[PDB]
Design a protein around this ligand. Structure first.
Ligand SMILES: CN[C@@H]1CCc2c(ccc(O)c2O)[C@H]1O
Lengths: 286, 52, 332, 236
């Protein structure tokens, strides 16, 4: 049982890190009024999504994988799956919203102070969570997601086993809603922002080239994008494949990639809370 | 010019100064006598506190 | 050149006399006095609604009402007990450097980078009178009564105004710097002012003449306030030192400074009993100084930017700090 | 009893609505400070584009410029009120390298000292400066004539060499170009050393005849806000 103990320790460390980071950033936002900013509202929404993930689906999923059987009821299986889809969709779409906000900030500086306001940030967050719920609770709870092959219906009939079997159409639609569309939007906006940064650096080199007066931009963009891309891209490509091809993807690989995607919730506060104000707030709190 | 300045200094010079011990004693006596009425120095009960 | 020599001789005589009357420092007398101990202050009410940084504030005769001035061009009047905005006054000039709430409770005056001093009638909210005549930015204004106001401006001269006639009744010249703040004595007879030069002077309102000059500081003076007794006053300097002067002894008594702070004091106020010298700082926090012992009692922190205003109620119940962060935190 | 509370609540609601309406305008406007040598450039640029406040809107963006009113003050304690402005517009007479105002060296050492004081001010550690070298034509006329020598008033001009990477005017004498770049390079040497990427200086060789200075100010403000947003994140 050494391997089981090691896996349990690893998942316990993962959930502890996720919960700790999320509660830290949320309480840093809540306690100090200086941190309350229109972008920080999106940061808070992402932190809340990651906190719900770490509190709900990481521990129950760990218990399921260690026990190899679902102790709780079928309704609880459905609710856990719905919460998982909700958390993933909300987190990724909130990352997309943050990217769009930054794109509007750099690209249109004069109109930024009017295009985004404190009142409309709440509307944007509500829309993101409503879309996540509609793509998560509506199909899962009203039972539209289920497949029809013998293994899937056998798993559905038995309340002991809780595993994800889904239709091709729902899998494709959920993947497009959750990851692929936000991925495209984020790639476009970040390419535009990087182009703007390069243009500004060229202007600076033109004005003050003689005096000493884009590695930083590349490093920041790589940290922001690669961590999100490397965590979720394999999971979503295999998610599309395993409904495209029945026997292409094994269950163990699917779960491994799903948990690799889960780790992105813990990684998010490190990426998005490196500002000096957040660092000072964290030092003051702890 | 400097005539106004020197006249002002002359007017300011003709003044009476008490010993610093007397002034310190007066300030200390005032602080001790009016110490009871100070809410910041001795916090008032929450019932008597208007803001709290 | 002979006049300069006479002035130097008079200054030397003044220094010799002040040294002669100096017998024992205030610390020597106050050593036997027990310290106030650690003082814990927490924000009771937080006032929000200012668009830009807050530069000045003034309490009312009743402790409920206070008026605040901000560079956004608004002069908001709050209600401390219920945390409500009684009035919000638009301003002709966005830049305002001072405000005052009349003892009668009816008039509010604010001035700024524009030379005009504007007085607003609360109970009638329009500009009752625009007081013009200065050639510099106003720094501090206080009300002698419902009809008389004294202002401090960027030029070296202060002035006493008459609201009914809108003219300078008397002007207080003879100073050598941009006056940064002034305070009125508990009786309306006297007032003092500190400025960019190290000198802080005392003026007699009725006669119009200067009486005493204190040059203890080594840099500019940004804040000033009388002791509640009215026979002493403490000045806040652009350096780290805050000093307390005496009118009767005509010299500095004690200096409030610490080696751990190098910023400049921007606001000074006294407690009702006079044993606490609350002084704002260019640092984001505020310090509370034991006046008689120069030992720090408490620290007032919670402002994200430098504190530019500070006041203590007439009954001594509340302390409010107005920082460049658009908030008015009321302490107790 | 309850009537007073209801009245205060209604007054607070009305005042809060008015404050939100005022915020909708305040957040969308930009404040600029027109600071510089008071003997040159104020009248021309203000016409081209205790206190004087002029508002000009370009590309549906509301700007608002404040002139200090020419308060004769060696020490500027009112400059701390301008720690939130979008930019500081500095106007310097580039043609005054020989004039002497109790007179300063050239009025240009005075301009450099003023620029250094503004640049290194504690309250202006973030505010960028838009710099205008007004009276360009008079400087060219002075340089063309041999009556006054720049190297006499400015010792470093003798060892100065024109920059290889430069954009001279389509029709300009080489000596005038060298003098213009020298005057520009003094201000940029002052600006680049103290700065740490928070604020930058934008030089401009403006002239009284030119009427496109509003567009230049708009572009510099856009670049200032864009660079501030980029540096707010780890980018740039
Ligand atoms: C049970 N694990 C689920 C299965 C499918 C899925 C996930 C997350 C986001 C989606 O859009 C999905 O379609 C995974 O977390």
């Amino acid at each position: 049982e050494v391997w089981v103990v090691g896996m349990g320790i690893v998942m316990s460390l993962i959930v502890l890190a996720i919960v700790f980071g999320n509660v830290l950033v949320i309480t840093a936002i809540a306690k100090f009024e200086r941190l309350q900013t229109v972008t920080n509202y999106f940061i808070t929404s992402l932190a809340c999504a990651d906190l719900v993930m770490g509190l709900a689906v990481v521990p129950f999923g760990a218990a399921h994988i260690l026990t190899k059987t679902w102790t709780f009821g079928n309704f609880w299986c459905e609710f856990w799956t719905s919460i998982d889809v909700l958390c993933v969709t909300a987190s990724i779409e909130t990352l997309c919203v943050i990217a769009v906000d930054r794109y509007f900030a750099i690209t249109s500086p004069f109109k930024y102070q009017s295009l985004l306001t404190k009142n409309k940030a709440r509307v944007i967050i509500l829309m993101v969570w409503i879309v996540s719920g509609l793509t998560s609770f509506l199909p899962i709870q009203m039972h539209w997601y289920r497949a029809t092959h013998q293994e899937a219906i056998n798993c559905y009939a038995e309340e002991t086993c809780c595993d994800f079997f889904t239709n091709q159409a729902y899998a494709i639609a959920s993947s497009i809603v959750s990851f692929y569309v936000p991925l495209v939007i984020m790639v476009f906006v970040y390419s535009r922002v990087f182009q703007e940064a390069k243009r500004q650096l060229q202007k600076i080199d033109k004005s003050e080239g003689r005096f000493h007066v884009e590695h930083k931009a590349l490093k920041t963009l790589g940290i922001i994008m690669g961590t999100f891309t490397l965590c979720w891209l394999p999971f979503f490509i295999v998610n599309i494949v395993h409904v495209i091809q029945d026997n292409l993807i094994r269950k163990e690989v699917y779960i491994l990639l799903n948990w690799i995607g889960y780790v992105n919730s813990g990684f998010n506060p490190l990426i998005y809370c490196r500002s000096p104000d957040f660092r000072i707030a964290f030092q003051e709190l702890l | 010019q400097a005539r106004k300045l020197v006249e002002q200094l002359k007017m300011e010079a003709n003044i009476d100064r008490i010993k610093v011990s007397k002034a310190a004693a007066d300030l200390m006596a005032y602080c001790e006598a009016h110490a009871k009425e100070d809410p910041l120095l001795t916090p008032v009960p929450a019932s008597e506190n208007p803001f709290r | 050149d002979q006049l300069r020599q006479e002035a130097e001789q008079l200054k030397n005589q003044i220094r010799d006399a002040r040294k002669a009357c100096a017998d024992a420092t205030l610390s020597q007398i106050t050593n036997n006095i027990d310290p106030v101990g650690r003082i814990q202050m927490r924000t009771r009410r937080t006032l929000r609604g200012h668009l830009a940084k807050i530069y000045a504030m003034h309490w009312g005769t009743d402790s409920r009402l206070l008026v605040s001035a901000s560079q956004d061009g608004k002069l908001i009047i709050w209600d401390s007990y219920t945390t409500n905005k009684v009035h919000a006054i638009p301003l002709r000039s966005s830049w305002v450097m001072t405000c005052a709430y009349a003892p009668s409770g009816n008039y509010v005056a604010c001035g700024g980078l524009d030379n005009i001093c504007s007085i607003y009638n609360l109970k009638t909210v329009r500009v009752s009178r625009e007081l013009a005549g200065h050639t510099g930015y106003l720094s501090c204004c206080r009300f002698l009564d419902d009809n008389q106001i004294v202002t401090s401006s960027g030029d070296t001269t202060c002035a006493l105004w008459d609201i009914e006639t809108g003219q300078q009744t008397t002007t207080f010249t003879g100073h050598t710097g941009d006056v940064m703040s002034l305070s009125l004595a508990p009786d309306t007879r006297l007032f003092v002012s500190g400025a960019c030069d190290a000198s802080a002077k005392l003026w007699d309102v009725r006669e119009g003449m200067c009486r005493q000059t204190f040059t203890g500081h080594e840099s500019d003076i940004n804040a000033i306030c009388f002791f509640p007794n009215g026979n002493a006053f403490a000045t806040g300097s652009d350096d780290a030192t805050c000093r307390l002067f005496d009118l009767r002894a005509d010299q500095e008594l004690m200096t409030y400074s610490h080696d751990n702070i190098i910023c400049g004091i921007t606001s000074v106020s006294f407690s009702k009993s006079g044993r606490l010298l609350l002084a704002g700082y260019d640092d984001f926090n505020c310090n509370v100084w034991d006046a008689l012992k120069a030992d720090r009692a408490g620290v007032l922190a919670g402002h994200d930017n430098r504190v530019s205003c500070l006041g203590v109620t007439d009954d001594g119940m509340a302390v409010a700090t107005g920082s460049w962060d658009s908030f008015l935190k009321i302490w107790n | 009893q309850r009537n007073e509370e209801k009245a205060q609540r209604e007054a607070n609601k009305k005042i809060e609505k008015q404050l939100q309406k005022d915020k909708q305008v305040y957040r969308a406007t930009h404040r600029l400070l027109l600071l510089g040598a008071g003997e040159s450039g104020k009248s021309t640029i203000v016409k081209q584009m205790g206190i004087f406040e002029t508002k000009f809107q370009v590309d549906k963006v509301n700007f608002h410029m404040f002139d200090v009113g020419g308060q004769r003050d060696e020490r500027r304690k009112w400059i701390q009120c301008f720690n939130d402005v979008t930019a500081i517009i500095f106007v310097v007479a580039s043609s005054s390298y020989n004039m002497v105002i109790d007179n300063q060296t050239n009025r240009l050492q005075e301009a450099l000292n003023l620029f250094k004081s503004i640049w290194n001010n504690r309250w202006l550690r973030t505010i960028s400066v838009i710099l205008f070298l007004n009276k360009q034509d008079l400087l060219a006329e002075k340089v063309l004539a041999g009556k006054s020598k720049i190297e006499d008033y400015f010792p470093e001009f003798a060892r100065y060499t024109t920059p290889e990477d430069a954009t001279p005017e389509p029709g300009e004498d080489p000596r005038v170009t060298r003098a213009k770049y020298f005057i520009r390079d003094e201000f940029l040497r002052i600006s680049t050393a103290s700065g740490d990427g928070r604020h930058y200086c934008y030089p401009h060789f403006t002239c009284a005849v030119d009427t496109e200075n509003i567009r230049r100010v708009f572009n510099d403000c856009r670049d200032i806000i864009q660079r501030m947003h980029l540096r707010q994140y780890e980018l740039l």
